[PDB]
């Protein structure tokens, strides 16, 4: 997270950390708990090649990485069939937990938007994670969960900015319709925030608008961050997750 504060100790009860085996269970990707047995995440964190589930764990909300861990095992990984790379689209995935989670005052599920929501500019949206704090700077050894409020852009205004300073012909669509744009040179997601939720407060309720997907570096001029647009994939999500 570039810019932004440390997160209060009760503000995003749905944030998930993904861990990979090694000398220690290292954090590498984010997610959100959307059902007591399902985690929503980015496809490029886990595919396109198949992974051994022995190497993966989920950790639920905690203020500081590693300090008090309770690693949950994963039963199944589901990646959208149309994913190969992030820039092409369908960067979305599901993890099914072995054991269901007790909903508690510390851990609660985020709500998915209705298919009609568009998230026009001016809405209040945040992104949260444990990723790098600047373009080459790791998060320091205490490892707090950070948060930042980002602006939203319309897709066509975002696509136009990506053509500035590029050889790409401006007939060639870069930002597809299953995507969403947010952030600016002072405020962005960064490496290791991938797969994390983007949430907006609509009519008093927090809805997950997007998933951190890709971008041309962190906080660079005319390069907003790209998010997978959750409303585009609701029918695919509800084929596995019990609504």
């Amino acid at each position, epitope marked *: 997270i570039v810019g932004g504060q440390e997160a209060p100790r009760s503000k995003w009860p749905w944030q998930v950390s993904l861990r990979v085996h090694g000398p220690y269970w290292m954090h590498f990707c984010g997610g959100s708990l959307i059902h007591p047995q399902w985690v929503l995440t980015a496809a490029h964190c886990v595919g396109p090649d198949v992974k051994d*589930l022995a190497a993966l*764990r989920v950790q639920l909300r905690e203020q500081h990485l590693y300090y008090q861990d309770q690693l949950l*095992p994963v039963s199944r990984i589901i990646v959208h069939p149309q994913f190969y790379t992030a820039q092409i689209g369908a960067d979305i995935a599901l993890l099914e937990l*072995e*054991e269901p989670v007790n909903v508690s005052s510390h851990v609660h599920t985020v709500t998915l938007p209705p298919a009609s929501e568009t998230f026009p500019p001016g809405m209040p949206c945040w992104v949260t994670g444990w990723g790098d704090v600047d373009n080459d700077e790791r998060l320091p050894p205490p490892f707090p969960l950070k948060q930042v409020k980002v602006p939203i852009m319309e897709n066509h205004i975002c696509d136009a900015k990506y053509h500035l300073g590029a050889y790409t012909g401006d007939d060639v669509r870069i930002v597809r319709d299953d995507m969403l744009c947010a952030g600016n040179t002072r405020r962005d997601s960064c490496q290791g925030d991938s797969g994390g939720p983007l949430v907006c407060k609509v009519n008093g309720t927090w809805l997950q608008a997007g998933v951190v997907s890709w971008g041309e570096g962190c906080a660079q001029p005319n390069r907003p961050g790209i998010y997978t647009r959750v409303t585009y994939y609701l029918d695919w999500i509800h084929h596995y997750v019990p609504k």
Partner: antibody
Amino acid sequence: VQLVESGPGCVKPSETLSLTCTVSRFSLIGYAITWIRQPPGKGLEWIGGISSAATTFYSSWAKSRVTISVDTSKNQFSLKLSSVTAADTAVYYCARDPRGYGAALDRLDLWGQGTCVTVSS
Amino acid sequence: QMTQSPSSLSASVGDRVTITCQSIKSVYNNRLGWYQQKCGKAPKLLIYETSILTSGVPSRFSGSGSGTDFTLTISSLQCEDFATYYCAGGFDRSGDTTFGQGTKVEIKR
């Protein structure tokens, strides 16, 4: 990188059997342990286990009498069986599931050398 | 609950053998494994998830199956293949999981 059981070897009836299993390097964080029993001449039967999430699972009969626990301060897993009887005479093993599942038997990759327990007067 | 067959078999060095395991229900999602136990030792995992060979196991062993019926097969008997063999599998999460009765393999020489 290996497990070791420990136990009394000989016990009388109506005591409680205690067993421990210790991991010799690397921590246990992230891993499940299951307890397997082998009566003389029989095959293998499953007692129970504990997941990486610290959830405990027990087979049908064990639920009445068994407790499984973990103590990170000692790098140990422990099995306790109440009210032992002669039919409990078996070799006991601890084994690891690398996925951290608390109740699965298809991928027990790492085993202790076993400990034999005799119930007799 | 499961059955494993045959309960014993006796074959020549060099030869091929097969072992079958069957169930009333179907394994949850490819959750079936094969173990080798030699006299006086703990079981060793050979095959997991129906068909993945464990590292360092010689490619003499192979396994396949279809949710309800599964087979373990050797390409060629060596002397140290003397052992008992067990299937194991799980039919849900958190519940019904069990071993098979085991099979005893004799070398003839």
